[PDB]
């Protein structure tokens, strides 16, 4: 009875916290248009349907979003996959050349300024002997003045040759389902009120994650995942300021964004099999790209998040908002890609408020660069191809990214300011629910049995 | 609907309960442990790490007495210096996650003793068939 022997059970449900690689899998809707239409049409397997999202009881696991893995590898995965869709495309060695620029035909003012430069330049032909003269349109943010006449040059030519993206491939987001290989599991917190740090009381395992689309944006992340009922703020340590503050709200704010100008693309043959898609002529009115949001929905959704923010700071606290403090371009504004073209849109028009402790719309104007320098890589740029026609897109603003000003000296006002900074804080808004554990079977246990001879 | 009783037979469904759930589910976790251009290289090395990890465990059962029984039983007595507990309280009051930490301060003492006991039993069995 008390002469207990031991038995080793194999296959015992028990795990540890570990770190491993994952495996992407994309849905069948992205395979209906094929042959390098978007990236990772070949890099991912097609999905199995409807993973075994089953439940688990009497169970409690502490999570973390901040020292979590699988976001640290995804920022490497998307960059490493982003580089692969460029190397089959054209280099721009023959185009870093002297430019002869002038103003576009427009009623120009003395104080205010134009934003398009009509530039002509020498260029090679398919043949090597002959040359040609050809012209295009460019933005103010891509030419600098080399130093009567006034001749320009491109901006990135003193640091790196540039890669034109092929116009066949698209940059639109697609669903990506990560999956764990054999011998691992993915747990998912299913709690309602859960700030992302600390023990979740109702976990549920799953085979693969749900729909995770990759977007790119610094402030005001787009097409995100909605909150369940309330509006939730999340942070690592709110009394600290150097960490960002993720704000995820419930009712999505619809945002319209457009460029009303009408383009024309114009192919220039550089050599054999080379095609520089320059901008042709602009038909109609030279107008500025802009975005609209609704006034009342925004005044409401700030009223929700102030009610949520006052829980951590005392009820008697002045909360106000301000424009971004400064820096480079694509962290003061907010950026996004709208059907193959990148915007940079001033957002002073939203964060001009204060909040006491008791038909119209908002327009906000944008700028358009053509070359990007994403992830601030030392040997990289990307000339984007211009696209035809009047362009617009509709999106759901879903979360904010904030930063407190950490001032000393006896403050009741606790001002907040937007800021993008790292790209990973986009991603942590998506993978905060999951974690990866490693099954270790073959437990061992005393019981009352003895193996005979 | 699918009901409550289906997740009792799901993968890792018995993890939250006591051993009585885990006394019957052991085929499922054993089943899902195996079956699963530079991306092909990374997933290929993940797959071979998975099967190498499996085959280490089949080897480590092979050097013990139980080859593929999946419910072993063997011949070292349980030293009560570790447990210090009554019988059914580790059969009805505890979970396997809870059982993990109480035997995590010490390990491979048990794995050291099992190899020695099986090697000794094979020696005495070789003597028994040697006189036979």
């Amino acid at each position, epitope marked *: 009875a008390e002469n207990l022997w031991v038995t080793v059970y194999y296959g015992v449900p028990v795990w540890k916290d570990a770190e491993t690689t994952l495996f992407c899998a994309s849905d069948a809707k992205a395979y209906e248009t094929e042959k390098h239409n978007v990236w990772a049409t070949h890099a991912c397997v097609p999905t199995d349907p409807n*993973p*075994q999202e089953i*439940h688990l009881e009497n169970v409690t696991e502490e999570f973390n979003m901040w020292k979590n893995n699988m976001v640290e590898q995804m920022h490497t995965d998307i960059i490493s996959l982003w580089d692969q869709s460029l190397k089959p495309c054209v280099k721009l060695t023959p185009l870093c050349v002297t430019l002869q620029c002038t103003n576009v035909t427009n009623n120009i003012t003395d104080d205010m300024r134009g934003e398009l430069k009509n530039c002509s330049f020498n260029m090679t032909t398919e043949l090597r002997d002959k040359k040609q003269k050809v012209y295009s349109l460019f933005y103010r943010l891509d030419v600098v003045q080399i130093n009567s006449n006034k001749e320009y040059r491109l901006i990135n030519c003193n640091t790196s040759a540039c890669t034109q993206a092929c116009p066949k491939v698209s940059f639109e987001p697609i669903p990506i389902h990560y999956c764990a290989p054999a011998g691992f599991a993915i747990l998912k917190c299913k709690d309602k009120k859960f700030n992302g740090t600390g023990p979740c009381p109702s976990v549920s395992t799953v085979q693969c994650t749900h729909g995770i689309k990759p977007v790119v944006s610094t402030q005001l992340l787009l097409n995100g995942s909605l909150a369940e009922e309330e509006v939730m703020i999340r942070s690592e340590n709110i009394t600290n300021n150097a960490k960002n503050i993720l704000v995820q709200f419930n009712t999505p704010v619809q945002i319209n964004c457009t460029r009303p100008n009408n383009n024309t693309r114009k192919s220039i043959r550089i050599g054999p099999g080379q095609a520089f898609y320059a901008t042709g002529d602009i038909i109609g009115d030279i107008r500025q790209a802009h975005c609209n949001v609704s006034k009342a929905t925004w005044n409401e959704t700030l009223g929700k998040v102030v009610k949520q923010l006052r829980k951590h700071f005392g009820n008697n606290t002045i909360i106000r908002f301000a424009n971004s403090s400064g820096g480079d371009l694509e962290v003061t504004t907010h950026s996004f890609n709208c059907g193959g073209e990148f915007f940079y849109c001033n957002t002073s028009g939203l964060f001009n408020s204060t909040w006491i402790s008791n038909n119209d719309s908002i327009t906000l104007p944008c700028r358009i660069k053509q070359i990007i320098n994403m992830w601030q890589r030392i040997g990289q740029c990307m000339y984007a191809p211009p696209i035809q026609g009047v362009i617009r897109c509709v999106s759901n603003i879903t979360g904010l990214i904030l930063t407190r000003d950490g001032g000393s000296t006896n403050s009741t006002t606790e001002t907040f300011r937007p800021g993008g900074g790292d790209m990973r804080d986009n991603w942590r808004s998506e993978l905060y629910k999951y974690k990866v554990v490693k099954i270790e079977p073959l437990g061992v246990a005393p019981t009352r049995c003895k193996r005979r001879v | 609907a*699918v*009901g*409550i009783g289906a*997740v009792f037979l799901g993968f890792l469904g018995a993890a939250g*309960s006591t051993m009585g*759930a885990a006394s019957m589910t052991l085929t499922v976790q054993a089943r899902n442990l195996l079956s699963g251009t530079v991306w092909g290289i990374k997933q290929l090395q993940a797959r071979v790490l998975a099967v190498e990890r499996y085959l280490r465990d089949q080897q480590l059962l092979g050097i013990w007495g139980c080859s593929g029984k999946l419910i072993c039983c063997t011949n070292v007595p349980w030293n009560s210096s570790w447990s210090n507990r009554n019988l059914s309280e580790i059969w009805d009051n505890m979970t396997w996650l809870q059982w993990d930490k109480e035997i995590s301060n010490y390990t491979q003492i048990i794995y050291g003793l099992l190899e020695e006991s099986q090697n000794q039993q094979e020696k005495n069995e070789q003597d028994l068939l040697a006189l036979d």
Partner: antibody
Amino acid sequence: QVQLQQSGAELVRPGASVTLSCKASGYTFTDYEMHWVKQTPVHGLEWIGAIVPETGFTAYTQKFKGKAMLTADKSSSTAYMELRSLTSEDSAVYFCSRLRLYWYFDVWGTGTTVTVS
Amino acid sequence: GVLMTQSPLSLPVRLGDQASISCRSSQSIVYSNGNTYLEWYLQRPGQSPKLLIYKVSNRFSGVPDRVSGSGSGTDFTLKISRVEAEDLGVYYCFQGSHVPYTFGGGTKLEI
């Protein structure tokens, strides 16, 4: 015979603990599931959870885990509740019921009115 | 949670006309094999709630040929072609994909 003979109307003083009884009949308990659904005028139909009576495999929601208990006696062939910390919102109408695995609700009982007063 | 959002609640429906009671879920209710398990309830004041449909479309045994469910993903609408006095009262939605299941708020058919 296929019935859910429940308990009676219960005018319960607050702070008390209620043992409900769902005498199901028509089949064995070992075949199929047992379930409990509330009825409040605030929400409509609410939840308690579910029980499997062969082993005692229980599940609940987040709202009532740690509040209610589900026990099943295999010999007496009854069901049980063990409520704790009865509140004014808990005054409801309880419907015992049955599911099969991968099927629907066969039987629906009378509904025990448990008022907390 | 996976709480259902019923639209609309109150429908005073004259006798002989049609009725449409939609639910919208927070997530997809796709069960892990392909067969979603949706259910629609009855309720009269003084009767236990009982089932009309146990699928997207396939119905409880004994239910007449006037009630039909349809929809996809999140949006799932009940449609009654001819409304009688038995149809009056509270209807609900129900999920079967993964536990814990959530009822709605209750949609009353009136006259």
